[PDB]
Amino acid sequence: LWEAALTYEASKRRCWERVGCPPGHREEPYLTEAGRDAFDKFC
């Protein structure tokens, strides 16, 4: 199970604001650029 769990890939994205878990955290785009659903929410 640990080895089945071993086959998990994780994000290479790091930041110098984070040191304790550098598994990435998805900057999460903003101002339009989050796509149609966010634009509809903005509207």
Partner: protein, 82 residues
């Protein structure tokens, strides 16, 4: 809204643990490669689980050596019969 934060964090922690395990296994594989151990990722993972599962390290080492000798004998038998 309160409850959802725990399961997401737990899942993230599990994924981080998995990534850490993967990194550790990669380090171990690199160590084996430098040491020319001949273990593959699946075999290395199985061995890691066995040691983590409490196998006696003297017993584990003897068993691993015997299993490797048996695997080599089986490969030699398969190559002699082929």
């Amino acid at each position: 809204m309160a409850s959802s934060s725990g399961a997401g964090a737990a899942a993230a922690a599990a994924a981080a643990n998995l990534n850490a395990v993967r990194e550790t296994m990669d380090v171990l594989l690199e160590i084996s490669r430098i040491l020319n151990t001949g273990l593959d990722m699946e075999t290395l993972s199985i061995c890691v689980r066995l040691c983590e599962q409490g196998i006696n390290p003297e017993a584990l080492s003897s068993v691993i050596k015997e299993l490797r000798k048996a695997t080599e004998a089986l490969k030699a038998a398969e190559n002699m019969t082929s």
